[PDB]
Amino acid sequence: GSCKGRCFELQEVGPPDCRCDNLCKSYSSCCHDFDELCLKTARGWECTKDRCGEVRNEENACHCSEDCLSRGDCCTNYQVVCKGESHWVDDDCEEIKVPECPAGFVRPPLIIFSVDGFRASYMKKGSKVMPNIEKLRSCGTHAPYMRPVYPTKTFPNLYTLATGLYPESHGIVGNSMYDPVFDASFHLRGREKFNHRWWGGQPLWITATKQGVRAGTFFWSVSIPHERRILTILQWLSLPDNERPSVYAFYSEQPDFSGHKYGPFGPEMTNPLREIDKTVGQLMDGLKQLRLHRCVNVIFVGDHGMEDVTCDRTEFLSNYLTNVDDITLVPGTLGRIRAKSYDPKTIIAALTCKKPDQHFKPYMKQHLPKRLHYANNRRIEDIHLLVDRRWHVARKPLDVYKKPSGKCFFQGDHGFDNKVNSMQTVFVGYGPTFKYRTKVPPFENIELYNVMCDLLGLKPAPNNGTHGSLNHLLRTNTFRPTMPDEVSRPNYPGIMYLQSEFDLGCTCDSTKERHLLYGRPAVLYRTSYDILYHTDFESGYSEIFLMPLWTSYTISKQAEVSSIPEHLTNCVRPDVRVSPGFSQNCLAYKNDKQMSYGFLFPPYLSSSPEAKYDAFLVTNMVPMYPAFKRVWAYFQRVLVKKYASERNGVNVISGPIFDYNYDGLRDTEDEIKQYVEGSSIPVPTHYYSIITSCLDFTQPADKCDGPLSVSSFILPHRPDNDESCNSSEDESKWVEELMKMHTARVRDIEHLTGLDFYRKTSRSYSEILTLKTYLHTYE
Template sequence: MDVGEEPLEKAARAGAAKDPNTYKVLSLVLSVCVLTVILGCIFGLKPSCAKEVKSCKGRCFERTFGNCRCDSACADLGNCCLDYQETCIEPERIWTCSKFRCGEKRLSRSLCSCSDDCRDKDDCCINYSSACLGEKSWVQETCENINEPQCPAGFEMPPTLLFSLDGFRAEYLHTWGGLLPVINKLKTCGTYAKNMRPVYPTKTFPNHYSIVTIWLTAKYQGLKAGTFFWPGSDVKINGLFPDIYKIYNGSVPFEERILAVLKWLQLPKDERPHFYTLYLEEPDSSGHSHGPVSSEVIRALQRVDNMVGMLMDGLKGLNLHRCLNLILISDHGMEQASCKKYAHLDKYLGDVKDIKLVYGPAARLRPSDVPDKYYSFNYEGLARNLSCRELNQHFKPYLKHFLPKRLHFAKNDRIEPLTFYLDPQWQLALNPPAEKHCQGGFHGSDNVFSNMQALFIGYGPGFQHGAEVDSFENIEVYNLMCDLLNLIPASNNGTHGSLNHLLKNPIYTPTHPKEVSSLVQCPFTRTPRNNLGCSCNPSILPIVDLQTQLNLTMAEENIIKRGTLPYGRPRVIQKNSTVCLLYQHQFVSGYSHDILMPLWTSYTVDRNDIFSTEDFSNCLYQDLRVSLSPVHECSFYKNNAKLSYGFLSPPQLNKGSSKINSEALLTTNIVPMYQSFQVIWHYFHGTLLQRYAQERNGVNVVSGPVFDSDFDGRYDSSETLKQNSRRVRNQEVLIPTHFFIVLTSCKDPDQAPSQCENLDASAFILPHRTDNSESCVHGKQESSWVEELLRLHRARITDVEQITGLSFYQERKEPVSDILKLKTHLPIFNQED
């Protein structure tokens, strides 16, 4: 035992003796290591440490310590790195790359990525290439004329995208275009209309409905459609939805909507739509809240411009920017609201508890007790009570069938019988508490007011390059989109072919409608003359001379035609109509045996023609080429306090001869006319027409009666005419509901009407009323109100054609599409006018 234990004891004693020195050595070694690390950080690793401390790049939400932090607690501690917001927080709420984000460490909560591997992951922000790789964005590239579609594999035809910016007033681009680089480039490089006319009332839903529902047409013809929040797309129409659609949710970010459409464009070929719609609520929302002239609207415009830029960059990234046809559009404009420009019905009616009013600039009135009193309510009496109540009254009450025909706002039971037309910038409410949009902005006014005009830009391989076109109505866009998609349009209110000049290669060639009723002959007869009960001035030629001078040869008729019908004879599209041509030396008429009056009369007023002041109110000559009717006799109208007759071709027109135009006194040149309307008719012919002829170097006039008793904007059928005839002195009389006037001259005022290369035209559809209360004429001279009335009731020539069953300009040599462009034109009224 002793021998065995000795070595252990010896070792223990030796170890105890060495302990102090061992600890000193170990302490020294540790001190050297620590000093080495510190010196390494200070000298060798200083740049790296400093970089980590100053930037959050690659450190977002990591609990690393230093001079600044990048975790969620740094905001409370106040020691965030300077780029914390841009690098760590903004990726959660923005959809773009920036210099702070390029090459970022992938963040799970970011909306899109700017990391180096984002292309492999297919989650790059739209502007990654331009922000991080130095490539040009779409807006930075120069304009290019895309002559042919350049589409990726799998796209057999260019898709079409209809993109609506709600409430984008046309004037915004005129005024603020310099702040909107993307939209301004689309305008410059594509096809741009300075104004696009909305439908009336100029509200969001009626106009979006009027522009589409092309997705139905696409589906019926084998194409697919995808819509993102287009009004009306989330309800069934004819039992159908678009192939892809979204239930409206205004909280969905604009960027998310654009990315969704870009994703749809990447779907497999058998799932991918051919037609797309996209909708943004701006700048409408900002316009309502702050008014159209506000910094908030400018910011909203810049925001939507960024969204359009995001779309274009996305299309470029998909190589679709030379393939897709884009239509950038809005539904209406915006007007500045003012509490001082609100009219109130209680001011005139007192108690208004029994009526309800749809407030605003296109107000409508109905009884409170609906439906019981809807049809029995005295709308006409209330309209009279509210008419002309004070000087400079800013609203006019209208029974809806008296509204200007160009508004097309009557033929529906959902439109109340009593409506109100408001001056620009004015609105109507029952009383002050019922005011809405008293501040900020509003819309809904007359669709020819300049501040109600909408945006239209077309861009892509289907559109003209760098073209600016005249204004047109949004009902024409449907046919345009059908042409871009090679679809056959459904029956619609547009005029197919009228926008051919917007397209590079129009696929539709319009033609004039065919005349469906053959002309009949109206030769002179041996019928004995009747006593018409007239008293003519003896200086007028005797009747026997009229028969002799109107017995014309074909050669003489051709000479007359060149002067009176320089743009061709109106064609009659009415079915089963019996019409003959009556030639006189100064005018030609299309006389209808069905209504016993001309459907139309045409004559030309040259610059130097003058009008006499003779009164021919009781002088008629019997036209022996047609059978006489009691409505052709002076005696028929005597002692009638309201109804008389008017001349279509004015007998006062003197074309370079001292002789009276006695041919205009023929019974085939008159129409039944209320005496109140004669005031308008006489002032137009005696004053305005002469002035127009001087200003335009001559003007051709076509005028005639209109029959639209069911106020649908289309000519009455023979059955409807019979049902609405009036009985006067035991005689059935057809009294026109309106009269139309079409004025045509040369666009070049140095050319006379017979020499026109390009035409300019104006049309009017004037309501034929028993009084002139519409114009509040009491104590006024005609010069102060007649021309204003004409302007209010101006119309498209297509409106005249639809309501008369006539077709104009069929003998012109221009392409029919150019004629349709003329027919659908309607001038915009400046707010200051």
């Protein structure tokens, strides 16, 4: 068989027929004439003045004979060089107010141009280096940066872009992985990447296909040059409407490859950036030549950035563990440890706060910051090392390969925590469905799959994006988000019980408007809970979990911090609105030698000696380890008031999270694995707070007319502070840094609590969704 008239065919052939498709050279074979017919290289990829009107030679990679338009095989710059047309980049931008597409185009095509290792800061280079990219950016919709997923590696991020899912959900949790159910390893080298068993979720090309939208093959054999890929995309675009794809992908391994070699700031980086820009120019000139340049939506997107990393900055596990022969380490900009064929508790202890400058931190995966969403997959090893930016971790010195000079082969790497600035990457949308010359706030790459679906008129598969949160990127929104329905209505108990009906072993001697600024959270699961009002705070008290799901209070800029009278030490009061049978009891805490308790509304911030008594109600009490109380006390005593001063008032919503199975979702009763001893009082795995104020800080938090400003955290409820290497010191030296490490989105808290916040504002729901997906990152 021949490839004549079949080069890079889209439709599937059977095993027996010889292949002519994008991947036929990858661990496979093509028709014998595939190279001759489909991989022409003669005379390169650019028309020159001397080639214009050349006699046609069928060996040429592309053609500059005048028949090339009718044959569909011009070089992308043919009309520029030979017919006096301008390069696309030399045309001033004009708003694409409507798609300018041929008849038979049911929708604008989507072309996804992904670049590997493209730091957000490279856009600083400007038209000097990247004129085509600069035009897309300045004339289209762009963000200052896009946040990748952790780990900030290629395959996890590419497949996240494709599926809208966290790595833990789509299954590509690294560039290297071991799956203990397969008992098999995944690597980038070799053929495992082609085995479908690794890839979960539903990538865009499958979503497209299943809904009758035709996809261009997203994948190319490594031997097929970039320029051939661009020409193929353009040729596919000229197919008749019954064969033409609506979505296309081009991927470049640059600037990542050069980034590793020369580091992100090396003078050698200019050249690769120029070459990427040339490739964009080829695509745009090609589209213009097809008159599709005001028809197609283009996304220019990176998977991650690039950090300065040299092998002199390597931590070795063998400086911490005497026996390293019994462990397998996935090394580099992150660490994952498992047994080679060993005790995890011993390993963690041996790796914890051992050296003053220690450039990694060990974790059990369930204790990693929840914002990373990196635990709920069997391919993620229990033991994880978060590596400091600019560093590597390795097993022993001999695993590092140095030149004779001592210098290493690499000066850049990536993979670090996705909060790190050097890991941030790029997003640009250009075309009729994107806004014109519009800057949008930074966002997470998990959100893009929904956008790409909307651009193609596809119903997205279930994913971790928040559908509607990027509506502000698009001219026209086919999807309009709706606020979810409240599932459980609250009770509003009055005074129902006598003091004397309580045997809890405890001893002691406008609310809405000012404390719930954005409406009551909605409970989106089936349960029984009560709204409890007080002078200084409001709560939604769970009769199932015997504590608030949420506690809401406002602290003005002028609010005063007080201390507890000695007599109120150990004070807990029964709540006459809540049944003894649905209350905590103090005996459980007395008998649980490991467990103490804290309060969601702090007595410290009571508005009067009288009101302070409300804070000591059993319904405001939550189980807290002594170690964690050090964190919580400092947050409540010092930080809340600091934030109120700095932000001109703050509204605080705090509560427990239960995630014993570390899936990032609210546990049901049955999934709770720890209770206060001898009681039905469940122990939170985490405690959250959402801190809201006016974006315009000249306005107080309770009188805000415009956009809101939020910061949130999900603190691990740990019986120790081993995570914080300075925790032997005053809380002023370490608690706030701990909190910043555990920063979160409101959305993260919503998943973990089954609550919906901000249901009553003066803001559009679309805008609220962006607020909920916002992540305040620090350091």
